[PDB]
Amino acid sequence: LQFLRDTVFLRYRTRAYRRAAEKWEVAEAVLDVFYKLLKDYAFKPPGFSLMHHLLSPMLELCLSLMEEGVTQLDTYAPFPGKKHLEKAVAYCFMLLNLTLQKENRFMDLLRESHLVTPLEQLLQGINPRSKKADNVVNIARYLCHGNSNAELAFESAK
Amino acid sequence: HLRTVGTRRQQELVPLEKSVTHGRGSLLIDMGLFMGRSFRVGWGPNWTLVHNGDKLRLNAEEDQNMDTIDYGFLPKPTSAKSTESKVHMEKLSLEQKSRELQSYLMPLEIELKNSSVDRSAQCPHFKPNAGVAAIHDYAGWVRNLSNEAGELEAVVKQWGLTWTLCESLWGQLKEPNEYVRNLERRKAFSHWLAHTAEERIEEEVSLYGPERHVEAVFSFLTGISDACRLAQDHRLSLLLSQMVGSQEMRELISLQLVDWNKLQERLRVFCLLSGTPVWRSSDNRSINVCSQLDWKRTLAVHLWYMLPPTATIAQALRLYERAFQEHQRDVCVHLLKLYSERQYDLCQLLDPSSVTPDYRLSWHLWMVLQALNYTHLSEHRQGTLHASYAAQLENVGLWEWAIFVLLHIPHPHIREAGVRELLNRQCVVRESPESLAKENFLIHRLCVPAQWVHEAKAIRSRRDYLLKGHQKLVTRHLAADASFLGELSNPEHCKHIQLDYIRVIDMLNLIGCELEKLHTKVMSLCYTAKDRLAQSEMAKRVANIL
Amino acid sequence: MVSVINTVDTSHEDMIHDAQMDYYGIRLATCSSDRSVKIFDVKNGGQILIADLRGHDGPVWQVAWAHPMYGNILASCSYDRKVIIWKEENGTWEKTYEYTGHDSSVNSVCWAPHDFGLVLACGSSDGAISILTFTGDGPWEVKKISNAHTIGCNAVSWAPSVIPGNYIKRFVSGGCDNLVKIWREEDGQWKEDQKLEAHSDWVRDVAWAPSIGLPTSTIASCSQDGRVYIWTSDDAATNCWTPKLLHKFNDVVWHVSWSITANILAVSGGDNKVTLWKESVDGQWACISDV
């Protein structure tokens, strides 16, 4: 799990540098992996560590994706790119929503386990980060509203 | 009871061992999580404990394979191990190879024209004849043609020199006729010695000259007119021409010059014309030369000057030989020692002779000498040794010559029972599978005539037919063959041998199937076998349908 | 000690006791301490498994292929007190017979030279050897020798088939009493022709070298003392076995085997190493090489 996630963020910059079509696909694969991780969500401590990993650079990456989406609405289509890009956007939307309901129960439990302190910091530091920084996601939502293509709009409103 | 007590002691040790293991788990137990840096532990002991349990007092102790297995090989080895791999993929080439190179088919074939054989109603034999002459010719022409290649080098030259010192000397030494024969042997050996100490004196003495300084004058003398011309010491020049002269000049010039020097690259020249260069410790010059020069270079001096009596050359040679000492394996040297010998005494030196031998040359050498009467070799240990060496040489397809030798060697029997077994192995299957062509027929032809062809063919069939055997089991074969000519041949073989019911059925077939079955039943009277016959008939019907 | 030796040798990969090549060099039967008799095939130098004949309650010790004149037969003995004979009928590697006539472990097996018939000799750790003789069908009659060796038998080796040209066969075996007993058989029963005491401890293995047609029959033996002796008979029919020391190692020698042509001894034992030995032209044995 560590190897793939590390590769994927690096590749996304790597994907962008070479071949827009092939970078996008890698990003879509990463989004799929994230979705799988969400579905999946000693052992409890490992889960807490994973939650901590999920909650600053990773948060920024989602923001970068949102910025790409804001760029995206204006130009391209590119449906195959759009599906993968669209799918990635949907995954980003869903993970925060799916994660948040899970996260509040999850984070408190992690804190209880800590009675670990660093992971708790994620509860503290992670919470501060979440508010954002709101604008970039919001712009993407506005673009989705302008598009009126459906979907994306639900995840944006939720 | 003692063993039981030891087990009781062994059992106690095990309990102690168990306690120690428990302590290790107790002391070594490691519990880091979720993920922790790895730490040392006695992980290995647990793994060894299971093995010890599998091995399991006295019994377990003397029941643990020290390794522990040994693999025995025929032609030739196999592999084995236990163990760093337990098989080795040997790349053919490795160490031993000189023997193989020396025994390149030809070293055998050529010798076969000379050996001859006794053709009879069965296994033949061998015969002797101008053996020496034969060996001389082959070694001659062969050696000459060999003196032209492009690889190895050093090795080839050494081999050639050894062969020349072996066969050469042998022949050279196989009332004025004795005087003339010694002059002729001395004449052949002299130049021979020079050629031997060549290349070494060749480029070597070359530089020596084109270099500096003295000594060379002595080295040219070991090689005379060109040396004198290059040197051109007027008085020394006249004395130098007395070399090659066995004349009683020796003593005079010897002592007188030494005395003159005492009263007062020249004394060494005088030591040579004295004719006793090394054994005369009085001059103390040509012994001390042993560190400087090859033993072969010092031999050449003895052979060339030792003295006019044409036997004294060999004398002094043997001398300097048994003389050297620094602080055995020189082949070319050991041939000289063999040559310097006389005969008889067979009971010791005949005994290192085996050392030397231990391949094909040694065999041929002993055989010619024994047959010729010059050296009656003997007999069974020497033959055992030749037999494995010849078999090692077959491995790569040396079988026919070895078989012939085995037949001739005997003796007078028992060997045949072994040679026949070897032939059977040779054609058990692979013989029948590798011979399935034209390569087998020639080999079969080559071996001394015997009715061994049917025997080899039959073995091949068994591994993988009835007609070949002719040239219960037969019934089974008939059932499989529920082609026609072969079946007829099998029937003929059965008749020759004379299942009776089956034979009757076969006769009926030769003369329908149901009638044959009835005949078989009648034969049985005067059934699983019947069922088998029915199955064979069904198979035949299937074949007909196909 | 033994524990120290075990510590020194961790074992890179699982281990096996004995493993013998087939006649014709096609197959390679093996056995290990896991009770499993694996038959591999070696076509072109590559090892390929064909069957895992499982069936022993204890670790299999030694293994021996029968002569191909009787079809394809392989026999293996074990610490379970039993000996198994596996036949082959079209790839049908089934056991056609099983023998359980010894009360303690069976250290070794060996097949009589193919002329004598299909005789299998077997030495137990009870101190008894059981020999199985083949008849017409699946019956096997046993000729048992009780109290052959004092505290048990480790090695069994057949004398080469020597034509009297009315046939006499001699077999010599080693055991844990230090004695290398030879054996003589008449009408049926086997009697000890002679004892050979030169070892100072348990005889491990005893190999009767194949005669190169040569009448100077030799036998090799190795023991817990760490000595290897090459006992010799100077002539036919003279009850003189004169032992000669090959070498002594500070550690035990486990196994000894004769190479066919040159009479090279493969000495397995001591330091996990196996040595190769040839008798020189001088009668002293020398080590050719380290494997």
Author numbering:
A (entry chain A): 733 to 773, 794 to 807, 810 to 869, 873 to 915
B (entry chain G): 213 to 268, 271 to 296, 298 to 300, 303 to 391, 399 to 447, 450 to 458, 462 to 493, 501 to 563, ...
C (entry chain H): 1 to 165, 177 to 302
Question: Could you give the paper's own sentences about this structure?
Answer:
In this study, we report the SPA-based cryo-EM structure of the entire CR subunit at 8.0 Å resolution and the SPA-base cryo-EM reconstructions of three overlapping regions at average resolutions between 5.5 and 7.9 Å. The final average resolutions are 5.5 Å for the Core region, 7.1 Å for the Nup358-containing region, and 7.9 Å for the Nup214-containing region. Notably, the assigned top and bottom faces of the Nup43 β-propeller (convention of Wall et al.) are opposite of those proposed for the human Nup43.12,13 Two copies of the Y complex are present in each CR subunit and are named inner and outer Y complexes relative to the center of the NPC. The inner and outer Y complexes within each subunit pair up in the same head-to-tail fashion; eight pairs of the Y complexes interact with each other to form a closed ring scaffold. For each of the two Y complexes within the same CR subunit, the stem is sandwiched by a pair of the Clamps, suggesting a stabilizing role. The EM density for Nup205 or Nup188 was assigned to two molecules of Nup205, not Nup188 as previously proposed. The two molecules, named outer Nup205 and inner Nup205, interact with the short arms of the outer and inner Y complexes, respectively. Outer Nup205 also associates with the stem of the inner Y complex from the adjacent CR subunit.
